[PDB]
Design a binder for this molecule. Structure first.
Ligand code: ZG4
Ligand code: ZG4
Ligand code: ZG4
Ligand code: UTP
Ligand code: UTP
Ligand code: UTP
Ligand code: GLN
Ligand code: GLN
Ligand code: GLN
Ligand code: MG
Ligand code: MG
Ligand code: MG
Lengths: 533, 533, 533
């Protein structure tokens, strides 16, 4: 193959996944088919168990892989569709080796981290690099592998040991390594402190990996002296020391790496055979008009959602002002303890141009989301409900229009006489890519989806709308292939009141915002009336 | 509790398991109930898959735990009966944490080696320390934990990190640490080189453990200067620097540790409330007569077997000269390529005073073991067959006495018309402690077992004697509680020709040799005729 | 240049200096001019302060460099003459950098170990590699650099960091690295334990050096499996894994490395443009006759002396049986406490074929050396006194022949009325290469020195023979160019009673034993009478 490893140096959060994604879009702009792998040094088999305050926004792949948000960054910088196993973990690789041991496949020998786990990592990286994850069935010409976390933590050591072997298993023309470090600039000092980068690259070389590129996460751009000091103490050429500094938009991060010569480097270094990103950045920096959108949440947990709104905003040509609202502040209980939280949350929601009610589980914020959907009905503010927001729209309709004031989910109040959304597992979770059929032409949503008869979108839910109560209910315009499951709902006599049972955000790209997020943004600025025209 | 960790320094093989066992017998001689745990930094769930050339002699516990030979050293130095989970491994602890993660028991948080695996290790060590593994149901007053391998290998790091926490979770009076190092004395140098011990203890302190005792595996005793240099560079008191040197018998190893003051140290250091070992050593060193016993093997793989013979030898008051014979050298095929191997193997077998035919699996040495049992029949040399040796005695009888010249196992020749031993799994492997009933009084074996109606012994086999052919066959004196399975066989008109289907060696102690190994040793020196009298 | 670094792995003493010397003689046999450097990670500026029980036998170079014995191994395997600075130390390099800092030569910047000390090491290694230390003024084509001690000790870290830079300063064709490890084979285990080699090479790679060759100091030869395991865990080709095992003579160590293919490796690896050692080994292994030589010492401290005797032995074609005698056991004081030591020491001295009385300082053994020279006079056993042994021969003559029974040195009894050897510093120590003139033809020593008018030999003393008492004294056949200092003495009417004030051993080679050591060996077997004939 051709491999680029991307290792983290000093801390997480420093945009290493944006660097990996930017390097992938740079390679793709060179005419290469490109795949990507995230290694997460946790013991978890997939992210499908995280409370979103830790490793927030589990991104759901077509196969039902509940993976880290960086896999979603890969799908948005590169036109790819990944599999579960593009998220590698210690849980997955140790369980693989343990099951393979119990099978007797290791032939009655000792099994131990070196070699056998570090072999298994290389086997995995070889497998997932061959898979044509790109928008055509042609084999990837390069694979960008990101090692999550910081090097020299106990969990990251097996993977660096595997890559230390890998660079001699495949030849050096087939394996490059980027180190993404931090160069802090303290309030206490004003200097750009290279010391952590030196010690991190010293540690990485102790684990037997050189940086071929040293990418410094700077705030403000590096001085020449600091770049030279990094080049010296990392024992690498200045041309291979990159600063990624603070820039006006995400769209400039590939352009900065381009300017920094990484394209030219990888072309020679791997012996290989962004004008839109200029436009997207320059377009963003000249958006004079604005749209204000309420996001009524519970939980970074809405990373894909925020990005989908920003794609939609860039496409309508407005700035976006996301009014982040805790849905538990909108609940009347908060007015008893902290009326300041209540009245700030309701000033936010009421001044919005439209509302977004994203997915989740558990009782927190449920009556607040039902009230934010109520506000969307009676004030006629444009509404999108995503996954849970759809279910709560059936609840809010039922309570006010049908007078079923008790009505709820079987999750939140199982004692209710009108369970209008019920537990309905797959005959497991409705998890991954399902096909929804549009049951009609009387849908703005169908027209936003290009007037297509069907769409295929990633779901992540156990509950569905009750088919008994459906007869009384609120036009369920999108339904599954079985007709068992309601997957898009649209309310009559409203500018834009849509529930989608799936997660549109997972298939939003800058070049193609998801049509429910686009329709919401278009509706909130009135421009939907010109779009459908 | 009270805990003593025992860590390995420079290499394996240096008798760390003998030190742990000796420290346990020293503690037991202080009137303490004592348990023990082996940690093996391999990914294997139990040893029940090893080809015995790697981590040789899988010792089978009462519960069917196929564990490392050091668990068997614990059962022979201390009057204890262990469980599977007294052998801890990375495979067991990672699989525990992974299953616990998949259960959601880690409450949707990240799971990672520190803390969660290092917690799980401490939980395990707390559980297995409370279990009364001793010959009475009273709780262990101290637990000797052995860490297998050398410290600062990638697999041993989680366990040392766990013990680094543990010493502050329980108080320092509850946790002591011994480091077992090597002090090499090269042919190239003649000096006792302390440098590896210094660097090993430097490394161990980098992992946050001090040696409370430094045990030097010496060849020849340490000089004063070398002990002082070790005390200096390990930064510990000379009284806490121990030499375990080469000694005439295993029985002197507790006595050397006693002389070295470890008893007195542990009494004060853990705030706690060997005369037989003098006798056993002094007895061994005055055995003027000898017995020569053939061990016809395939595979250290016979560690328990060799020890059981040596207990039996010490009890009859003879030295033992074990004629180690590869059973594939006795096969006529070896006479075509290497007649030197054949004739040396047959000089060994024929000059023996008795023969032992120990357990195993696969076709290697099977016709050689059948011929060594044939030699035992026709020359009337005393024979014990253990596990497989019993099955091959039914085969050898069938071939010569019944004229069923084809006869074999369903393992070795499944096409045979007389499958006299057949695959007969438990309605799994017959693995662990089963009760055998003696079906008669016409057994020397019953009388060696104290004239008891039953015995309980550890088995490890899938195959059993065919109950159809049994009617023609060779007195099956020991049978299971169901009468389905033949578990001891005894041939008439022979001094001592016994097959046992179990492994007697696993329940041999110096103070009580297993009666089939004792009866064999007694028979080979003729003394059985005085014993049964 | 071309550089070969030789690093130590597990312990010292394992013959790393013999490997460096053997590699140098192999390179020299390829027609290359070769120099060598020893780095000793001690804080001492030269070895000229060590009590010879620590880093024994300070070897004195032509310039007066009191250096480690490995510099003397270089001069005996390779026809070279080294300078002080071929022994590099932390004391020398830190003092260099400190003086250079105090000079302001570092231009008011910070000075710190990396870069500035690690620069200074490379500067030193560049300087000393250019010096034609060979027997002709032609520049060295390769430099073998030995790093003393074990890698990953705090003192060795600057040097490995320097070589980690050096391999990228000069190109990889100019820099190769050998790792000399130990593979122990314990009495406790019988296996050849590769684990320390794995961990040592793991540590070395953490410091950023690969072994290009892994040299295993074996006792018995490596098995194939152990070599393969080393090749695997050191991540290097089997052809580059060398065993140096126990062999019958020093002369076979280059031949074993030759057989192991290191010549062929270095030729390709460094892109470069032993039949006598067959002969010397095969000659040694067929010496049927023997010579027994008394070495009367105080203090490995006599390494050069023992080697010089063995060159002389090989040249006369006898084995050598060196009777190592502590000169303090010969003193009558020892007969009062330990008559066993006295009578064993005097059985040794009296049964010898000749005696050697080597250099030293301080009062220990002085009356014993005077008595061993007395025994040489009155029994007519052949005597060589080296440095101090000469001075004590003037004392022993004075006491018995002149009746000056008080007589001694000003070192040992400054109150004496006949100070026959006196403190006589250079108008400092008489240290390094001085020219001695033979004052006559009435000398066997002159004839052994080829009948030359002068010789040039390395001295290391402050005391000299008193020119007042000289008039009464014992033919001082060798004197300095000034006539001030007596440098060789020869007693009349004796087979061979010679004192030399210098150290002949420092210029002994296998191909050319030093003539006083050769004359002594010839005398002790009577063969001198045929040699001078
Ligand atoms: C090493 C990184 O260094 C630096 C340095 N300076 C700045 C940033 C930076 C990081 C994140 C963001 C960000 O999140 N911006 C938003 C957005 C819109 S679209 C999208 N991402 S996306 O959908 O994958 C699409 C690209 C393919 N993000 C509005 C929400 N904006 C700037 N990153
Ligand atoms: C740190 C250890 O240092 C040293 C230093 N010097 C020597 C030994 C040494 C090691 C093993 C052996 C050995 O195996 N000997 C035999 C035997 C009989 S009984 C038994 N062990 S046993 O059944 O557990 C019983 C005790 C409870 N072993 C004959 C086979 N003999 C000596 N160990
Ligand atoms: C990695 C080394 O591995 C092994 C493996 N096996 C054996 C040896 C070994 C080491 C030292 C000795 C030794 O010292 N022998 C003597 C001698 C005579 S000449 C001389 N050395 S010398 O003068 O420099 C001359 C050569 C240029 N030494 C008699 C005193 N003999 C064998 N070394
Ligand atoms: O308080 C003091 C005094 C002196 N020094 C000396 O300064 C040297 C540099 O220590 P720094 O922490 O300044 O590191 P650096 O220059 O490599 O990296 P940044 O500043 O960009 O973070 C050290 O190696 C030590 O000799 C200190 O570190 N701190
Ligand atoms: O007590 C035990 C049990 C098990 N093990 C397991 O054995 C593995 C090998 O540990 P060794 O110390 O046997 O190392 P090695 O085979 O690489 O080298 P030598 O024997 O030649 O010195 C370890 O990684 C661990 O899983 C032990 O080390 N020790
Ligand atoms: O070749 C040489 C020359 C000098 N030295 C110097 O010797 C010092 C001691 O290095 P050693 O390896 O002799 O260690 P030690 O004395 O602590 O332990 P053992 O001998 O008992 O194994 C080192 O710290 C270094 O300064 C060497 O190690 N090797
Ligand atoms: N993805 C979500 O928003 C989940 C919604 C709801 N808890 C369900 O399981 O259907
Ligand atoms: N424990 C053994 O000796 C095994 C014997 C035989 N292979 C069986 O499985 O019964
Ligand atoms: N080199 C030696 O043997 C020293 C001899 C004596 N102590 C002197 O200084 O002259
Ligand atoms: Mg600084
Ligand atoms: Mg030492
Ligand atoms: Mg091993």
């Amino acid at each position: 193959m051709k491999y680029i490893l991307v290792t983290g140096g000093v801390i997480s959060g420093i945009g290493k996944g944006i660097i990996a994604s930017s390097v992938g879009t740079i390679l793709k702009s060179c005419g290469l088919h490109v795949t990507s792998i995230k290694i997460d040094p946790y013991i978890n088999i997939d992210a499908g168990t995280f409370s979103p305050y830790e490793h927030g926004e589990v991104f759901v792949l077509d196969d039902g892989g509940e993976v880290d948000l960086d896999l979603g960054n890969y799908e948005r910088f590169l036109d790819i569709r990944l599999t579960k196993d593009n998220n590698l973990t210690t849980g997955k690789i140790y369980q693989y080796v343990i099951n393979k041991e119990r099978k007797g496949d290791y032939l009655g020998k000792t099994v131990q981290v070196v070699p056998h786990i570090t072999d298994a990592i290389q086997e995995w990286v070889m497998r997932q690099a061959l898979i044509p994850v790109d928008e055509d069935g042609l084999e990837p010409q390069v694979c960008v592998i990101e090692l999550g976390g910081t090097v020299g933590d106990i969990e990251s050591m097996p993977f660096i040991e595997a890559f230390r072997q890998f660079q001699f298993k495949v030849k050096r023309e087939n394996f490059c390594n980027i180190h993404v470090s931090l160069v802090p600039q303290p309030s206490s000092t004003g200097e750009q402190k290279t010391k952590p980068t030196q010690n991190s690259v010293r540690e990485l070389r102790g684990l037997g990996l050189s940086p071929d590129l040293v990418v410094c996460r700077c705030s403000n751009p590096l001085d020449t002296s600091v770049k030279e000091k990094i080049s010296m103490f990392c024992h690498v050429e200045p041309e291979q020391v990159i600063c990624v500094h603070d820039v006006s938009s995400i769209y400039r991060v590939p352009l900065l790496l381009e300017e920094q010569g990484v394209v030219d480097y990888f072309l020679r270094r791997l012996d290989l055979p962004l004008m839109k990103w200029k436009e997207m950045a320059d377009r963003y920096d000249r958006l004079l008009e604005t749209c204000s959108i309420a996001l009524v949440g519970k939980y970074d947990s809405y990373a894909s959602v925020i990005k989908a709104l920003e794609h939609s905003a860039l496409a309508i040509n407005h700035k976006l002002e996301i009014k982040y609202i805790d849905s538990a502040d909108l609940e009347p209980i908060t007015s008893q303890e902290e009326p300041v939280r209540y009245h700030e949350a309701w000033q936010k929601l009421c001044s919005a141009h439209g509302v977004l009610v994203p997915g989740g589980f558990g009782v927190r914020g449920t009556e607040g989301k039902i009230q934010a959907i109520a506000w969307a009905r009676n004030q006629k503010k444009p509404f999108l409900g995503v996954c849970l927001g759809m279910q709560l729209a059936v609840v809010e309709f039922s309570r006010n229009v049908l007078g079923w004031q008790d009505a709820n989910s079987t999750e939140f109040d199982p004692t209710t006489s009108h369970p209008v959304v019920v537990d309905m597992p797959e005959h497991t979770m409705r998890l991954g890519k399902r096909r929804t059929l549009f049951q009609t032409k009387n849908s703005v949503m169908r027209k936003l989806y290009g007037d297509a008869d069907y769409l295929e979108e990633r779901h992540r839910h156990r509950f569905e709308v009750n088919p008994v109560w459906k007869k009384c209910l609120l036009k369920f315009v999108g339904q599954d292939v079985e007709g068992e499951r309601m997957e898009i709902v649209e309310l009559e006599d409203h500018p834009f009141f849509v529930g989608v049972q799936y997660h549109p955000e997972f298939l939003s790209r800058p070049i193609k915002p998801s049509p429910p997020y686009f329709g919401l943004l278009l509706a909130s600025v009135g421009r939907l009336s010109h779009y459908l025209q």
